[PDB]
C-alpha cells in the first residue's frame, strides 16, 4: 500500500511568513493528491486537489506543487486564521494507494500579549463531594504560557491538568484552563491557593484564601 | 448540499455498530462517498468508499472490520466487531469528481470503545471569590463524564457571545472534564446536555461564591 510520509510534524511561522509542507508517496501518484485544512474541533476542509487546483473561495496563497512521489503545499502570507493542522491525501483511485499523510501543525506567531488571569474558588456543594476542583484561566495570550500552582507557598506537582483553545483568528492568541484537584481533606488544610501564569521570566498570578470564598 | 453523521455511541468491544451519514441537497445516484476516521488527537485514516453506482472498496487494513452500504438517504458505515483501538471520530464524505478525494464532510460522530459504563456529568458553577470587585466571568465546570460529547449552551443557546469552552481532557478514569466560562457586563444558566445519558442540567451561577 501507498505510505505518504508529511514532514515536518509541526511548524510555526510568523504572521506574513511563508510555511511550507511535504509530503513523499512511496510510490508514485501521479498528479492524484488534494490537501486539507483542520482547524482544532472542526471538520477538515478541501484546500486543494489534483495536486495544484484551488477549492471554491480557497485563497491563491494556498500554493501546492509536485508530481510523482514529491509534493508540496506552500501557505504564503500567513495570517493568524491559518494556524490548524494540515494534511495531505493521495487521492489516487485504488484503494491501496489512498491514505493521509500523518499531517503538519502549523502554529502562527502573532504579537505577543501577556496574559491576564482569573481564579475560581471552588463552590460548597463542590467541597461537600470530597474531590475539590479549583479552576485557573488564562485569558488572550501569546505566545505558550507555562502554569503552576501554589499551595501556601509551595509549588504543586500533581493534581494540574491543563487545556488550551485554538489560536484566536483575528489575533493569534490562545486562552487556557488550569485546573488544579485535591480531596477536600487536603483542601481544607491549606490556607492560599495560587495559580501562576509564566511567560519566560514575567508572571502573573492569582490568588485566594480558602476561608475568603 | 450536506452530510451529517449520526450514531456515534459508547459500546463494550465486540458489540456491532452502525453509523448513518444522511446526505441532503443531491443524490447518491450521482455522487460516491467515502468514511475517514480520526482517533482523538490524531490524524486522518481512510477507510473505504461507495461509489453512486453501489460499488465498495476498503482499505487493506479496514477489509473485514467495517461494512459500507446505502440506502435512498445514506451511506452506513457498519462497524463489525469494535475495538479499544476504533475509538475514533467518524466522517463520511462527498467525493468530488476527478479523484477519490472529498469537498463535502460532515461534522463527524464519535464512537466510542470501552469496558467503562457511561456517566452522567456533575456540573459546579464558576464564579469570583465572594466580593471582588468588578465585566464579569463566570462558567461551569462539567466533570466526571463518559462518553463524550457534553453540549454546553448559555441562556439555552441565546448566549454565545464571549463564550469559552475548551477542549476536554479524558482522566487516567477515562472520564471526561471541561469548563466553559463566558463574559458578561455586570444572570447566566449553564445548560449541560450529555445525549448519552439524556440527561440536561441547568445551572444558574451566582456572580460570586458568598
Known amino acids: 500500500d501507498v505510505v505518504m510520509t508529511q514532514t515536518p510534524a509541526s511548524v510555526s511561522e510568523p504572521v506574513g511568513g511563508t510555511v511550507t509542507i511535504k509530503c513523499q508517496a512511496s510510490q508514485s501518484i501521479s498528479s492524484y493528491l488534494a490537501w486539507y485544512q483542520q482547524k482544532p474541533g472542526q471538520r477538515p476542509r478541501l484546500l486543494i486537489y489534483e495536486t495544484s487546483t484551488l477549492a471554491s473561495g480557497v485563497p491563491s496563497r494556498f500554493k501546492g506543487s509536485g508530481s510523482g512521489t514529491d509534493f508540496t503545499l506552500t501557505i504564503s502570507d500567513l495570517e493568524c486564521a491559518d494556524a490548524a493542522t494540515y494534511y495531505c491525501?493521495?487521492?489516487?483511485?485504488?484503494?491501496?494507494?489512498?491514505?493521509f499523510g500523518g499531517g503538519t501543525e502549523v502554529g502562527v506567531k502573532g504579537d505577543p500579549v501577556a496574559p491576564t488571569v482569573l481564579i475560581f474558588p471552588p463552590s460548597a456543594d463542590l467541597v461537600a463531594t470530597g474531590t475539590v476542583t479549583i479552576v485557573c484561566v488564562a485569558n488572550k495570550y501569546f505566545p505558550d504560557v507555562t502554569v503552576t500552582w501554589e499551595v501556601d507557598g509551595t509549588t504543586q506537582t500533581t493534581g494540574i491538568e491543563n487545556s488550551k483553545t485554538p489560536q484566536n483568528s483575528a489575533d493569534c492568541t490562545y486562552n487556557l484552563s488550569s485546573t488544579l484537584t485535591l480531596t477536600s481533606t487536603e483542601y481544607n488544610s491549606h490556607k492560599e491557593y495560587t495559580c501562576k501564569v509564566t511567560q519566560g521570566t514575567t508572571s502573573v498570578v492569582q490568588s485566594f484564601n480558602r476561608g475568603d470564598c | 448540499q450536506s452530510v451529517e453523521e449520526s450514531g456515534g455511541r459508547l459500546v463494550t468491544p465486540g458489540t456491532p455498530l452502525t453509523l448513518a451519514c444522511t446526505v441532503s441537497?443531491?443524490?447518491?445516484?450521482?455522487?460516491?462517498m467515502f468514511w475517514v476516521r480520526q482517533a482523538p488527537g490524531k490524524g486522518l485514516q481512510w477507510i473505504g468508499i461507495i461509489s453512486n453506482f453501489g460499488v465498495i472498496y476498503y482499505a487493506t487494513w479496514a477489509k473485514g472490520r467495517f461494512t459500507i452500504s446505502k440506502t435512498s438517504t445514506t451511506v452506513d458505515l457498519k462497524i463489525t466487531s469494535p475495538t479499544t483501538e476504533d475509538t475514533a471520530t467518524y466522517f463520511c464524505?462527498?467525493?468530488?469528481?476527478?479523484?477519490?478525494?472529498?469537498?463535502?464532510w460532515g461534522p463527524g460522530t464519535l464512537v466510542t470503545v470501552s469496558s467503562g459504563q457511561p456517566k452522567a456529568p456533575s456540573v459546579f458553577p464558576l464564579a469570583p471569590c465572594c466580593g471582588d470587585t468588578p465585566t464579569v466571568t463566570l462558567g461551569c465546570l462539567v466533570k466526571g463524564y463518559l462518553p463524550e460529547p457534553v453540549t454546553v449552551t448559555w441562556n439555552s443557546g441565546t448566549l454565545t457571545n464571549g463564550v469559552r469552552t475548551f477542549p476536554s481532557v479524558r482522566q487516567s478514569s477515562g472520564l471526561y472534564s471541561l469548563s466553559s466560562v463566558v463574559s458578561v457586563t455586570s444572570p447566566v444558566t449553564c445548560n449541560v446536555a450529555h445525549p448519552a445519558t439524556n440527561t440536561k442540567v441547568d445551572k444558574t451561577v451566582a456572580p460570586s461564591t458568598c
Open positions: 441537497g443531491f443524490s447518491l445516484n450521482t455522487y460516491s
Open positions: 491525501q493521495s487521492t489516487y483511485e485504488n484503494p491501496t494507494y489512498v491514505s
Open positions: 464524505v462527498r467525493k468530488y469528481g476527478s479523484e477519490w478525494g472529498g469537498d463535502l
